[PDB]
Amino acid sequence: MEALVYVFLLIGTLVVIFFAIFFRDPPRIA
Amino acid sequence: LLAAALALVAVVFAVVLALFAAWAA
Amino acid sequence: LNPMWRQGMFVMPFMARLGVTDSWGGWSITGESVSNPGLWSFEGVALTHIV
Amino acid sequence: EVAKDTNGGILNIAPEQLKRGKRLFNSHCSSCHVGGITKTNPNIGLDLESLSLATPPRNNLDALVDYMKNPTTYDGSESIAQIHPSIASSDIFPKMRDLSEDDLYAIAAHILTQPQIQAEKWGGGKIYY
Amino acid sequence: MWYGAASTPIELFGPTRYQWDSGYFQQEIEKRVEESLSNGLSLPEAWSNIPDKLAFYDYIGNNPAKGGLFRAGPMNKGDGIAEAWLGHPVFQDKEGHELIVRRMPAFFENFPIILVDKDGIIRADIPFRRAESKYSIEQVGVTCSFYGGKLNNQSFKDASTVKKYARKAQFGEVFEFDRTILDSDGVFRSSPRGWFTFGHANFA
Amino acid sequence: QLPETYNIFAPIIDIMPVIPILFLLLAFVWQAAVGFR
Amino acid sequence: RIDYEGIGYLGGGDKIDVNNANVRAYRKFPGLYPTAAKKIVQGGPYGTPDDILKNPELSERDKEVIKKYMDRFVALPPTPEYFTDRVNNGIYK
Amino acid sequence: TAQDVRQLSYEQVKGTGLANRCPEVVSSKGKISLDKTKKYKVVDLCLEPKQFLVEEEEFVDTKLMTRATYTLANIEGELVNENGTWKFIEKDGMDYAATTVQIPGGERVPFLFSIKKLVASLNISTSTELGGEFKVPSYRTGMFLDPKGRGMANGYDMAVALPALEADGAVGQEVLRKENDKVFQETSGRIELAVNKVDPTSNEIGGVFVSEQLSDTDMGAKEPKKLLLKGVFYARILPS
Amino acid sequence: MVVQEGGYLAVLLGVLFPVAFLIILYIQSEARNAGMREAA
Amino acid sequence: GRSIESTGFAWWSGNARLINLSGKLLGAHVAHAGLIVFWTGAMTLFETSHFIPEKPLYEQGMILLPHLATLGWGVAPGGEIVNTYPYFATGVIHLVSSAVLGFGGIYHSIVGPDVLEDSFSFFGYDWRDKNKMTTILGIHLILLGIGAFLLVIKALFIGGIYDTWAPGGGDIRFITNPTLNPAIIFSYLLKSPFGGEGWIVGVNNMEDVIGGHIWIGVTCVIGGIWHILTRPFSWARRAFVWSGEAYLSYSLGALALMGQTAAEYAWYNNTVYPSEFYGPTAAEASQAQAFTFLVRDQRLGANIASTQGPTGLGKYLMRSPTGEVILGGETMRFWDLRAPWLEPLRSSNGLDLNKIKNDIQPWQERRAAEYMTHAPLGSLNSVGGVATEINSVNYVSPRSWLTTSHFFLGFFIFIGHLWHAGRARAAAAGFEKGINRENEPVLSMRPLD
Amino acid sequence: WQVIVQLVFLALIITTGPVIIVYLSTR
Amino acid sequence: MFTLKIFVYSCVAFFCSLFIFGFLSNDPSRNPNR
C-alpha cells in the first residue's frame, strides 16, 4: 500500500499549491 | 441521432440567442 | 564466502585496515581465534568513540 | 570476376559496368531488392546461397538475365511474369520498357558482385546494417 | 578506492571491476592449474587444489560495477549468502573442442548466452528464435564436466542441465547460495568499494 | 521531357524556379544599399 | 517450452522435421519450394516420412523431387506450438 | 434477412453493427431432404453469441470488454452420413474469435471462442439438433512474448531481469519455473447447437445453439475458467 | 508488491523534519514582524 | 515615407509602411501574385523537363503534374502519362502571365501614385470604410464562385476529370450526373472529423466533388452579390475590429485552417488525390502489405480466415469494433481505407472471404506490392523507407511533401494570426506602443487581495 | 557540358539582381 | 448512455453559446481606454 503514500504526497503538494495561491500575503505597492 | 439531442441543442442555443437579441436591442 | 564486504560493512574494513581485527566475541576477520584482544577490539573502538 | 554461364564461363567486370549496374539496380530493383532481401517475399532473396539453390540456379549472369526476361517460381515449375517485372511483361510493368540486354547484364553483374564485396551484408537484412 | 591501492585491500573492500575486466583471477587460476598439470597431477586434481576464495573472486556478483543506486543493503541481499563452490565447468562439443561461455561484461544488465571455442568461433548458444537456429545445445550436442569444487568429476550430457550451467556460466564461476535467510530479491548489489567511491566522488 | 524544339532550353529552366528566393534576398540588398539594414 | 529435442530439424540442420518445420526449411532442397513444400505441409502430419508420398493431389514431379529429399526427411511427433506456424512462423529477414 | 443483407451495401452497414449479426430465417415449416447415399456440405455457418457466462466457485453473467468482434462466420464443413448417423465435420472459415469478458470483482476473463475441429452428430427439420465436441487451441501461440520477453517458440528461457537469482547451483530459478516454461495448452470446450427455423426453398437452417467451452491459461501460468455462450446460429445446406 | 519497508520511514521522516523546520521559522518570523510593525 | 523617422517602423517591419498607401500596397499584392504565377510556370516547366515517360509520377518528385493529371490532361486509362504537352502549355501560359503581373507590380510599387484615393475614387479606400470593404469582398467572392464553376464546366463538358473509381480502372470521365442533393453534400459538412467519418476529407466520388463545387459556386456568387449590395449589420459592426491589420489577421486564421485541411486532404483522401499520381496513403500502403502477405501465404496453402496470430487475433483477417471483416495486424487501425484495387473484394459485412479465397486478380496483387513498396515513409534527404533503412532508394512520397509543407505553412500562418489579431486589438484601443505612464490601468484598480 | 550551361545561366540571373540595384544606385 | 450524451450535449451547447454570443457583445469596447 505504497499507493497511500503516493496519494498522500500528491495531496500534500496540491494543498501547498492551493494555499500558495489563495492564502498568499498580498503584494503591496511602494 | 435522436430528435431529443437536436431539441435540447436548439433550445439552449435559442435561449442564449434571444438573450443576446435583447442585449443588441 | 561471507567476508565483511559481502555483508555491507562500511566502517569495519577501516578498523581492520589499521590493526583492529579482533572482537570481544572471541573471533577475528582473519579467521583466527583470540581470547583477549584487550581494549582495542571493535566494541572497544565503538565505545571509546561514544565516550 | 563472376559466373557468365553454367558451363563455368568466367569474365572480369570493370567499374564502369558496376556503376551502371548499381544505378539501374537501384532504379528498377532496389526497393524489395533494397538490399536484395525481398520485401514482398523475404523467403526468396538475392543472396548468393538462395540464388544457387534455385532451379534453374541463378548463380550466373545468363540465368539472371533469363530470369529478368522470363521469371519463374523458385522450383521453376510455373511462370510469374504477371506478378514479377520482366521484359516479357513490360506492358504491365512499364519500368522495364527502357532496359536493354547490356542493362540486364549490368544489373546481374551488380547482383553477383555484391556478395563478394559485402559478404554477409548482401541479402542479410537489418541484422547487418 | 575505485582503481585499487595498497590502502584499499580486496579482502576489506572487495575486488575491483578491472580485475573482472582483465580476468585477473581467471588467468591466475588457469596458471596454477596448468602448473599442477606440469607436476604430473590430473585435471580434477589440479582444480581441486584451487581455493574457494580465489574462485569466489572470479565471480561477477562480486564485481562492484554490477549494482544499482537504489538497490539497498549488502551484496548478500542479491544473490544470497555464498554456500559452495560448485567447481569449474568445462564445456565440450561432440568433436571435443573446449567451449567457453562468453562472460558477461559489466556494462550489460543481461547478456546472450554464447559458447565459443579457442579461436573465438561460435560453436553453441541459446537461441531467442528457435526455428531456423543452428547453434542450440540440443542440436550441437554439448557436455559440461565439473572439475574441483562440490560437483567435482560430475558430467552432464543432457541439453537441459548443460543449458542451465551455461547461463550460470556466463556469470563466471558458480557457487552455492542461501537466499532464504535475507529474502534475497535476485538482483546484484554493489560493494563498500562502490558506495565509498560514489559518495566521495559526488561529495568532492 | 520538354518538347524537342524547346529541348535546347533545358538548363535555363533548371534555374527558373530558384528566382523567387533571389527576390527575397534582393530586398535585403536593396535595404543595405540605402543605409538601413 | 524451455527445452525442445527437435530444434535442429526446424531448418538450421541437415534434416527436416516434416511434421513441425516451416515451409522455409524446404528451401534447403532444390525443387521443393514452394509447391512440394506446400503440399507436404497441407498433407501433414505423418507417422513416417514415406507417408508423404501417400498423399493425393501430388503430381509426379512432386513425388520425384520428394523422393530425393526423402532421404533428406524425419517425422517427429507434431507439437502445436510449431505446427500452427508451418506456413507463417513470424520469420522474414 | 439473408436477402436483406444481400441488398444492403457496405456503406449502409459500416459502423451500424449489423456486420456482426447472424442472418435470420423467416420460416418454421418444411424440411431439407438428405439422401443417406449422397455427400453434403454445410456452408456459411455463422454462430452469434448472446450470453457469455463464466462459472464461479454456477455460471454468472459478465460484461463484454472487446465490443462487436466475437461472432464466428463463413465456417465450412462436410455433412456425411457415416454408418447411418449424420456427422458434421467442421473445416474452414472464421471458426474462432478472441474475446474478453469481465466478471464481478473486475477480473478480466479472456477466451478463444473456438469451434475448430468440431465433430457434431445430427439427431433436417425444426426438431433436428446438432451436438458436439471441439478443440480450443492455446490463447497465445508460439511466437507470443510476455512483458519480460518469454514465449513458447521464442523469447528468453529465463527471468533475465534477475541474474542474481539465476546464479547459484540447484535452485536456481526453479521457483519461476512455472513462468519460464511456456506451454501450448489445447483444451476443449464442447458446444450443442439446436436448429428451429428451416427454409426448404433456399435450403437454409438456423435456430438456437448452446455451446460449452474451456478457456485462457496464460501459457500455462494460471488455471482456466469454464465459459458459457448462449446464442443463435445460421447455416446453409449445399450438395457436394 | 514487494517494496523496501524502510522507504516508509525515509519518506515520512524526510518530508516531516524540514516541514516542521519551516513552520517553526515562519511563525516566529511573523511574530517578530508583527511586534516591529506594531511599535512603528 | 520610407524611413523610421517618417513612418515609425524600422526596415524589418519596413513592410508596415504600406498600410495606408493604397497604390504601393496594390503594387506589392500584384507583384506578389506575379511571384506566385512565376513559380507555378517555372516549376511546371521544370517538372515537364525532368519527367520520364515510363515511371510513375510519385517516383519523380512531382506535385504540380499530379494536379493536371487529376484534372484529366495527358492521361491514359490506369494513370499512364502519355501526353506531357498540355502541362508544358499551362506552364508556359503561367510564366508569361507572370511577366505581365510582374510589370504591373513594379509599376504600382515604384512608378505609380502612392495614394489611390486622390486621383481615383473606385480603387481608393479607407480601411474604416465598411461598405467599400464588403464591396471588394463581394467582387472577389464572385470571382471565386466563377472559378468553382470553371472546375465544374471542365469536369462536366470539356473532356472530364480523371476518375480512379471508374468502372474499368482509373480513367478520365465526363461527370454526367453531379450530386445536387443538399442532404448528401451538407452531410459532408456537418460530419465528425474523426475516424470512419473524415468530415469533408471523406469525399470518395467525383459526383459529390463536382456537385459540391456547384453548391460552393452558387454560394460564393450569391454571397458576393449579397456583400456588394448590402452593408454590415449593427452586431457585426460592434463585434469586429475594422482596420487593415485586423482583416489581415482574419485572412490569416482562415488560411491557417485551410492549410491544415489541405494537409489532411493530401494525407487521407485518394479521390481528389489519385494514388496513381500522388502515390498511396499510409493507410493504403499498410493495408497493401497485409493484403500482399495474405495473398502470398494463402498461395502457400494457409486458410487465412482461420489463421491464428500470436496474440490470438486474426493473422490476416479479424473484425473491426463494429463487426466488419478487416485485415489483421497493426493495419487494423486503417480499416476505414477505401481503395479502387480493394473494393472489388468488399461486401456488405466488410471483406468477402469467398472473393478473397477465389477472385483475387493479378493486377490487384501488383497494386498491393507497388503501394506497400512505395509507402509514404522517407528521410529529409529523400532516402526511401523506414528510418533504419539503408541508402539505396531515392524516394519521398508527394503526399509527405505536400502534407508536411502545408502543416508548416498553416502553423506559422496561425502564429501570424495571433500576432496580428493581438496587435490589431492593441492598436485599435490605443496601447500597442506601450503603457501610458500617466494612465496605467492597474494603478486605477483595487488590489487583488 | 550541361553543368557549365546551368552554372552560366545561374550566374547571369544571380548577377541580374545586384546589377539593377547598382545601376539605379548611380542615378 | 443516451441520457449522458444528452447531458454532455446540453453542457457543450450552453458554454459554446455563452462563448460565441459573449464575444459578440462589443468586446473591443471592453478596454481601459474606453
Ligand code: CLA
Ligand atoms: C498574409 C501574410 C502576411 C502579411 C501580408 C504580413 C504583413 C505584415 N507583417 Mg506579418 N506575419 C505573417 C504573415 C503576414 N504578415 C506570418 C505568417 C507571421 C508568423 C511568422 C508573421 C509575423 C509577423 C511579425 C512578428 C511582425 C509582422 C509584421 C508585419 C508588417 C510588416 C512586415 C514586414 O516588414 O516584413 C519584413 C520581412 C522580413 C524581415 C523578412 C523576414 C524573413 C523571415 C524571418 C524568414 C522566413 C524564412 C523563409 C520562409 C525562407 C528562408 C530564407 C532562405 C531561403 C534563405 C506587415 C503588415 C510586423 C508588424 O507587426 O508590424 C506592424 C512584425 O513585427 N509579421
Ligand code: CLA
Ligand atoms: C508547397 C511547397 C513545396 C513543396 C511541397 C515542394 C515539394 C518538393 N519539391 Mg519543391 N519548390 C518549392 C516549394 C515546394 N516544393 C519552391 C517554392 C521552389 C522554388 C525555390 C521549389 C523548387 C524545387 C526544385 C528546384 C526542386 C524541388 C523538388 C521538390 C521535391 C523534393 C523536395 C526536397 O528535397 O525538399 C528539400 C527540403 C528542404 C530543403 C527543407 C526546407 C527547409 C524549410 C523551408 C525550413 C527552413 C525555414 C526556417 C525554419 C524558417 C524560420 C522560422 C521563422 C518564422 C522564425 C518535392 C516534391 C525537387 C524535385 O525532385 O523536383 C523534381 C527539385 O529538384 N522543388
Ligand code: CLA
Ligand atoms: C469589379 C472590380 C474588380 C475586379 C473585377 C477585380 C478583379 C481581380 N482582383 Mg481586384 N480589387 C478591386 C476591384 C476589382 N478586382 C478593388 C476595388 C480593390 C481595392 C483597391 C482591389 C484590390 C485587389 C488586390 C490587392 C488584388 C486584387 C486581385 C484581383 C484578381 C484576382 C485573381 C485571382 O486569383 O482570383 C481568383 C481567380 C479565379 C477564381 C479564376 C477566375 C477569375 C476570373 C473569372 C477571371 C480571372 C482572369 C484574370 C486573373 C483577370 C481578369 C479578371 C476580369 C476579367 C474580371 C482579379 C483580376 C489580386 C491579384 O492578383 O490581381 C492580379 C490581388 O492581389 N484586387
Ligand code: CLA
Ligand atoms: C468570402 C468569405 C466571406 C467573408 C469574409 C464574409 C464576411 C462577413 N459576412 Mg458573409 N457570407 C458569405 C461569405 C463571406 N462573408 C457567403 C458565401 C454567404 C452566403 C451566400 C454569406 C452570408 C452572410 C450573411 C447572411 C451575413 C453575412 C455577414 C457577414 C459579416 C459578419 C461576419 C460574422 O459575424 O461572421 C460570424 C459568422 C458566424 C458565427 C456563423 C457561423 C457559421 C455556421 C456555424 C456554419 C459553420 C459550421 C461548419 C459546418 C463548421 C466549420 C468548421 C470550422 C468551425 C473549423 C462579415 C463582413 C453578416 C453581416 O454583417 O451582414 C452583411 C450577415 O448578416 N454574410
Ligand SMILES: CC1=C(/C=C/C(C)=C/C=C/C(C)=C/C=C/C=C(C)/C=C/C=C(C)/C=C/C2=C(C)CCCC2(C)C)C(C)(C)CCC1
Ligand atoms: C516591389 C519591390 C520588390 C519586389 C519586386 C518583385 C517581386 C518583382 C517581381 C517581378 C516579376 C514576377 C517578374 C516576372 C517576370 C517574368 C518573365 C520576364 C517571364 C519571362 C518568360 C520567358 C522569358 C519565357 C520564355 C520561354 C518561353 C516563351 C516558353 C519556352 C521556354 C522559354 C524559356 C524559351 C523588392 C522586394 C525586390 C524590393 C524593391 C521593390
Ligand SMILES: CC1=C(/C=C/C(C)=C/C=C/C(C)=C/C=C/C=C(C)/C=C/C=C(C)/C=C/C2=C(C)CCCC2(C)C)C(C)(C)CCC1
Ligand atoms: C466543394 C466540396 C464540397 C462542399 C464544400 C462546402 C459546401 C463547404 C462549405 C463550407 C462552409 C459553409 C464553411 C463555413 C465555415 C464557417 C466558419 C469557419 C465560421 C467561422 C466563424 C468565426 C471565425 C467567428 C468567430 C467569432 C466568434 C465565434 C466570437 C464572436 C466574434 C467572431 C465573429 C470573430 C463537398 C464537401 C461536397 C465535397 C468536397 C468538395
Ligand SMILES: CC1=C(/C=C/C(C)=C\C=C/C(C)=C/C=C/C=C(C)/C=C/C=C(C)/C=C/C2=C(C)CCCC2(C)C)C(C)(C)CCC1
Ligand atoms: C524570366 C526569365 C528571365 C528573368 C529572370 C529574372 C527575373 C531574374 C531575377 C533575378 C534576381 C531577382 C536576382 C536577385 C538576386 C539577389 C541577391 C543576389 C541578393 C542578395 C544576396 C546576398 C548574398 C545578400 C546578403 C546579405 C546582405 C547584403 C544583407 C543582409 C545580410 C546578408 C549578408 C545576408 C530572363 C531575363 C533570364 C530570361 C529567361 C527567363
Ligand SMILES: [Ca+2]
Ligand atoms: Ca427445435
